[PDB]
From TrEMBL, chains A, B, C, D, E, F:
<protein>
    <recommendedName>
        <fullName>endopeptidase La</fullName>
    </recommendedName>
</protein>
<comment type="similarity">
    <text>Belongs to the peptidase S16 family.</text>
</comment>
Amino acid sequence: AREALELAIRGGFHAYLVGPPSLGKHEALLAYLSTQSVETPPDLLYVPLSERKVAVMTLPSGQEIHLAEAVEGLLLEVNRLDELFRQGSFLREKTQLEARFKEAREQQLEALRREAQEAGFALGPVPAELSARLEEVTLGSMAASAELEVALRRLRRDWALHYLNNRFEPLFQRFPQARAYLEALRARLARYAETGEPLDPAQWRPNLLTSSSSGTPPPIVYEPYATAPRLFGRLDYLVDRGVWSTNVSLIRPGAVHRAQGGYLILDALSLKREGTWEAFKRALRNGQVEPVTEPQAPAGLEVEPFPIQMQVMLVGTPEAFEGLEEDPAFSELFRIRAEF
Amino acid sequence: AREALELAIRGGFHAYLVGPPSLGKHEALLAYLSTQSVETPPDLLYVPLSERKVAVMTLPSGQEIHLAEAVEGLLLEVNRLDELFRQGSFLREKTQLEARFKEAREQQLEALRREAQEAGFALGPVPAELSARLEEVTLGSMAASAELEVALRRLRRDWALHYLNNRFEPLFQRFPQARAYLEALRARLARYAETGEPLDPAQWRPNLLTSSSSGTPPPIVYEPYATAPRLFGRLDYLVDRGVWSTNVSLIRPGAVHRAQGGYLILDALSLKREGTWEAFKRALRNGQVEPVTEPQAPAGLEVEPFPIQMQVMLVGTPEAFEGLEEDPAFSELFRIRAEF
Amino acid sequence: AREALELAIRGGFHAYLVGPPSLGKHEALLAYLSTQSVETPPDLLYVPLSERKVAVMTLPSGQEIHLAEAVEGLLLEVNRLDELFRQGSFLREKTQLEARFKEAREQQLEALRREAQEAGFALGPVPAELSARLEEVTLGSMAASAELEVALRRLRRDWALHYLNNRFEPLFQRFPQARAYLEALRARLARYAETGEPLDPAQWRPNLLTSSSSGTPPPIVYEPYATAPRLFGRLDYLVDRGVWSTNVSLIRPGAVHRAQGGYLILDALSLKREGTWEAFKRALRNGQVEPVTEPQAPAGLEVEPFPIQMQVMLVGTPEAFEGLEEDPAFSELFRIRAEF
Amino acid sequence: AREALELAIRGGFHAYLVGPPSLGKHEALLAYLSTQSVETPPDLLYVPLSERKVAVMTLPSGQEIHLAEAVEGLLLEVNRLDELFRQGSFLREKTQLEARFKEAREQQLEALRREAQEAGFALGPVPAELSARLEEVTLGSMAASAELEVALRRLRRDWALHYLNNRFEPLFQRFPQARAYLEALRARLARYAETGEPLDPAQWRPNLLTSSSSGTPPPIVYEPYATAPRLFGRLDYLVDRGVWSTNVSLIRPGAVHRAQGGYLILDALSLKREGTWEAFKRALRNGQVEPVTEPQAPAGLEVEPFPIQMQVMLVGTPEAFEGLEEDPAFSELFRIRAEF
Amino acid sequence: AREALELAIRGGFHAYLVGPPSLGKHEALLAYLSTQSVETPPDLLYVPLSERKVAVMTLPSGQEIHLAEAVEGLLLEVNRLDELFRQGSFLREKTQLEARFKEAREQQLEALRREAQEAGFALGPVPAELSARLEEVTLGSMAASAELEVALRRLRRDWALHYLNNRFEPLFQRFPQARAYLEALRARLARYAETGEPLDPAQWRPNLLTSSSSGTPPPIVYEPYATAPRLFGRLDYLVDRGVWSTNVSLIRPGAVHRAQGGYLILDALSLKREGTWEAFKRALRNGQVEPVTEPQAPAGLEVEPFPIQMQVMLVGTPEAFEGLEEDPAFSELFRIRAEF
Amino acid sequence: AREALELAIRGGFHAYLVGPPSLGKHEALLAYLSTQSVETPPDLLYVPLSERKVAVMTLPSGQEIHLAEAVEGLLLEVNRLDELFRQGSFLREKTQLEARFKEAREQQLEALRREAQEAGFALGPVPAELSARLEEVTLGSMAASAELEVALRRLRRDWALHYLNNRFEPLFQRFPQARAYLEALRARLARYAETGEPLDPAQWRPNLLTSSSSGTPPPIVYEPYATAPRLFGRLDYLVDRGVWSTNVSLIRPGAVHRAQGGYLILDALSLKREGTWEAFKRALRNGQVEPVTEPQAPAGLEVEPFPIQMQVMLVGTPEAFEGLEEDPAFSELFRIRAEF
């Protein structure tokens, strides 16, 4: 009874608690677990490495709130980049290379103008094969033109990175686990500099899944209703007019996200009724799971599978277990049985 | 005389050799140096991290030929990527998600068609505010359409990287110094997969500057004609029609590139006649230099400065040195004077 | 055709070759593969950590022959241990502590003898409660006796380890990957010292599975007959009289063992006919497999799963593939299809 | 005087204090030293790696109390292992392999029974060489029987280690210096699982020798009575009936154990009177010493020598030193002499 | 205005603030900066590696006060060394080797005395070539004499280092960055032992340049008067009678020393009036500067250049900047311009 | 016999071979050992860290010849330093600071000369307290004079180290174990620069003790005559006139030096006859020994103890061992006894 339960707690083990038909057995296991304590759990959370790609991040317990606050500051850095490009020192480097490209165009124009022989500046007949020369200058002016747009972009980029490396340097040393994510944000702010294309905060913020936990009391989730979305989390979508979209902030946590580092108490009967035993088995066997998506939605995300790091306690009556007990994988995963 | 010279050789020192008006003093210093030997020099070379950005790479002596051969193989990998996208397993993943996007469009079309009330399929009057519904479907079909192009790109990309990581893995372990450059090539082949846009070999190949050297005999360059381009190298350009362009293969080595790890014998008189003392001073003081460009060309490269790693021997007559000798920086850089 | 095949070879990929009914298609793929070369494969082999437990060892290519030769020498070390216990220096430490235990017994005997009052040495009536004293001495002599056997064992052990650490020290530095296995052998020789119980060479030798390979030509196995034992290896047993037994030398290699680092050419039809598709799928998915045992044999081994490190080429006719092609896992594992 | 003493304290030095015949000179040196402070001393303690082998452990100051508390918890884990073997999931693996061995015996019995020709089941004449067959089955049933006991042990072991690795993992990371000792305890609990043989707490607990010390005030021991056991500690024995025994908890600390990290004030006269100068000299020279045993006791321990890590101050009158002063080793060890 | 300023603060940037003729613009920038906070600055300070050589040391913020206190204790260690050489154990090693050298002299004297043939001890005629023998003994006695002084020095040295290594060991582990400096002090105390030559505290103490700073508020220096000595610090000299001298304690901090880790507010007009723009430019470009010396003083120090680690804000009116604004290096260094 | 011997060889063990009175038993053990092979022995040698201090160096087998050749080159570097100080660039820095000190003296002289009031340049009466001023200038000129000698030394030193660091840099990377010794040589060449005091090659060369050995055949020394100097090596002395001296080249190797990595065959009888059993015991117990010196020589060296790294085989007749056999330390060190 209590001994089997203590054994489950002390061992690594997933367990199942078997009791009489009376209800609220969950609310007694809960009271019991909430007097224990566990090893401090890290913060596990989702972050966007791009608009489409979402990774799992692990931070020391308590640090995720601070990263999120730091990210809100980085988003406002677009206003600082704007002011940076109003500075005279930048405007001077800028016109300086503009003149470099005016010069090249407006000399090949003056070499094309010294056709005082048969032409007179456009803005004969006949041509005379200086007709080719006209194309040289045209094609060349368009090429110098695109080459100038690019060089301005590269210029804005370089200035932007000079400024941004000062903002980011403290962050890398404060959040070494967030390194790839901070690099992704830095690149994206650099692209705002090149392009002027504004950031949607909702595509770039970290998605904190649960509150940080000391371990005392342990994280504990009771799930009476075991659907796939409630166990595994789900991805929501925005449909504005006819347009579908989605982003990292639209991932909604399930029990595996909220119970990280702790205990997940699950109603067994509900697990059977719902589709979910087979998928639950797979999740436990693999150590990870993805959030539920709507198959055949015209929008999507590449989401890293979320690791399973909790201990599961199934609750039910003998009758409730009988369907489960006849599967050989049941006792392989749920080694300990506990009573009353 | 010989002692001062030995002293220069054994010490780290830049020197100057002072001799009578008779010519071929260079061809005697050369004969002398070519009996010495030096520490094995690494291969120093230029590689493109992008079409516009060029970095310096250091490889163990002899390895650059092998990297260059490996790069020629990587360039031909575009043909392998082509065959990869003719595979049934890929075509099936491809049509599979095509159908996913046809489904979404051609159901919202059938929901838009059940306006048998006042419409009849286009391909009244009046509208009736199902007019808005028509736009939902249009805007939504265009969005699903762009979302599909992107997802195909991401699909081709992912397949491409699966294949390319097998080709690149041996290279990273064989050429750990070439890591950033190999990553740049891998990304570029991945983009050929996304885009179909072919690679210009000349933009992506490493530019080997000198033959590898054992150190015996040492690398030795004699430069009788001390212009900036011949000392520091230069960047060439292609002008085809009126269009200017340039790339990493158009960097032409100077003496600082060819004398790496060894000796640069320089005619002193020529250094004075030409513009070049001031720039030479700067190069030595800074430990690095860039190749000469045509200022105000409408095309350019971002080129990492090339490190100076040679020992310089100035050759001349007493008269030839007098202009140099009156500069305080002269003897600071050229500590040793040698005779005859 | 050749292109798809080259693609399979250059990529990491498992492939399948589809051809006309004509036979010997295998002998042509073989001729082709045997002109390639692969990265040098490590030696993968089975070693016993105990009489019952078998682990996988990885050695640099070519080193396994040398370990096996070293192990043959270690087995003969039992003869050296025998001579060690014939040495006077050891015999003296030995009798020295024998006397220490004779002393303790044969003084408590002389304290028990000074019952000249009512006794006379055994080897009244009545007893007189010196009856308890008789038991003290008995129980005490038996305890001192067992304590002496143990101390002799500990003595032989310590001497044995002094000698054996000199033999083993070069081995640890020559074969750092073999460390746990060498420790197991050292402990077992130490136990021969304690116990006199001889070693069965067949329980302690490493089981080399294939000849070492440079990579040129690659390891290549053709398997026309795809039973579980021939793919995965098997465990044999000795039944001498009615007694069952087994050991690490009775593991027989299959194709996954012989094709390590190279290519496994497999007849597709045979894979279907035999039980084996499902188990083959599992092996590939898991990256590892165990050798086949006779279920319900009264003897067994704990065998570490052997990693799969080969590239598989399925050979067949279109007809031969049709049963396979209708499984979604087929093309997931066999990405590349090649012709003729 | 005070200067020589300060010099002794500040230097590393063993010293001797020479004073008038008046008593309580120790109680004045003590008052003085107890105002100083020293570098924080680690906890040095004895732990059992087996029932017979005792090692020295070093822990950060204050951590030994916590290890000892953790060890008390590990000892009670035998109760948890008991409950573990009452679990249905374990009982099922257990009968499962019991049946595997019943099957093998009770089929070879039915093959032995089909001697309906000349036999009739035992539980002719004559034999007929099926007499050999009877032995096959007997010898084979005994072998299958022993093989079953072993397999049950191995089974209990494996389950036990699954559970115990969860209990031990936090300990290894909390007490990395205690690693060998925790491994020894884990193995011993695993053997309780195999065997049912209970642990004697007194053989497995760490033996804390002194209270932890901050360094302020320093550890200080005054020893007026310099026998070998009081300086070096001793090993006690239990003699219950006639049986001798001993264990790690029966080691009694001496001054070298209690003064670790600090000062040992020693009466010089007493050092002379007692046997102990020669042994004290040796201890200091070697940096270590073992506790005193009763030579020729029929029980013993293998005890790692305990390091000497204190500074010694000899106290006496001029007369008291004269016997010591005439030994050349005296001043080599006691460099500083201090007065009054 | 405020935005440009925030931009300067958040970026790494040197800035200049342009305002109306009204005074106290500095006292407003100051009020503003003193509400910010910066990353904790290390302690940067000057330490003497010898009487003539001065290095820069970096310590964790707050640790320099503790090193300085530790150094004051090390200086007083000369008194402890004095007492050490009054110890009998040392005096005995000392006379012991004195006798060894008396013996050698006063036996070769007794071999020189056994010229009872023609001599009689000095303190004939004629000589007789025992005249050479007289010189042997003389030259030999002088050599044994110098060899004895040296051996006494080496003796005092060795004793001194035995004692000093106990004092220094805690310091090396407490101040690992101060390692070279502590080694220099240890050697110097060892030389006091050899030589008796006392230490001048002023030559050996660390020279703390500013108070340690948490970063809140940031270090801020306002410099209205921009002379070279006030910006860069200066070296003072002592002239006592006609004798010039100087030492590490005579280096006087300038603004670059006091503003380390923070902000240096500088009056622009004053920078122009004084000699100092050119030297300031150089300092910023190089990242370091040396303190001002009196050229052609007959005393000097070898002083490591002090790194520049502050952010500079120039203050002035438009008019005040015009002279500066026309230098291309101005805007290269002062990227941000701020108003009012 | 052979078995005991093989046992000794295979184990780590010191042994003793007991045989009949017939002679040449050594020459048979020798023949036997010279067919074996041992682990490659490092080169163990003596190097001078100063004129008085000698350390043990360990080099990879074969490298000591190369270090010795490198050292011969370093000794000749004094000739290169001479030429360096004949260079104009150095002479100019030199007179430059000479003038700086002439200036200071010959201005305070001209300030002392403007006593045209009551003086007239020396080279009244009465004085007039400008008498003090005369002393200021004198004392000041002497101080400026000594300060100049020092500054020239520091100047020569700095130039010398610039040159020498180029010569030494390859050596540090080629001989990382020789680091302290190379540093000592570099400092000594730097002092030749400061001082002009020539180096005695014999005080600075490494003293190679034995030829390098592959291990096949093993190093083997037979010692029939077991005096202390022949076992342990000795220090020689030079007595030129009456002056005693000694240096690292005057250390003469004994058997422990020549048998390093191998076998030392020792006549047992000779060990008894000579003083040497007690000292031999000590050497083995300590793992190291020093070479024999003449006690009470007026010259000496501080010599690091040389490690013992050989296996010892004592040879004799039963009679020869009897004196040894009765010492308890005998069999502790010589565990194995072998016959015939």
